[PDB]
Design a protein around this ligand. Structure first.
Ligand SMILES: N[C@@H](CCC(=O)O)C(=O)O
Ligand SMILES: [Zn+2]
Length: 134
């Protein structure tokens, strides 16, 4: 799984600044495929749930192009090579009202590198608000 959690949500449900931690991404040993393999363009990003359905907002930043990577394990290899973990920082949400159970910052896949991301979703196995085991 991919473990991330928000440690502070400053503001209101519809206008918030999140402080977050993406703490750990466990090895990918079950053969899960990259859900955006074969798209013309796909990014893995740090992004947040923007709607009640969990679709992506404006990403904090993009980590890598991944549309040529067939498996989720290959995506993990590229993310862990290019970013030291834990990934920590802030991002912002302005849009639909989200309660704490609807807030989440994590690793999204998406075709766009900036702007609201209706086709962006958390990568498979993303856990929001749950700490990893020691
Ligand atoms: N930077 C955008 C954030 C949009 C979002 O919630 O993804 C704004 O403040 O309008
Ligand atoms: Zn948002």
């Amino acid at each position: 799984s991919i473990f991330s959690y928000i440690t502070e949500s400053t503001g209101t449900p519809s206008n918030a600044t999140y402080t977050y931690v993406i703490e750990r991404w466990d090895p990918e040993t079950s053969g899960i495929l990259n859900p955006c393999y074969g798209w013309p363009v796909c990014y893995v990003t740090v992004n947040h749930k923007h709607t009640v359905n969990g679709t992506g907002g404006n990403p904090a930043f993009q980590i890598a192009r991944i549309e040529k990577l067939r498996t989720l394990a290959e995506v993990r290899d590229v993310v862990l090579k290019n970013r030291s973990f834990p990934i920590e920082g802030q991002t912002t949400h302005r849009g639909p009202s989200l309660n704490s159970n609807q807030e989440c910052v994590g690793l999204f896949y998406q075709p766009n590198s900036s702007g609201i991301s209706p086709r962006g979703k958390l990568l498979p196995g993303s856990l929001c608000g749950i700490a990893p085991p020691p």
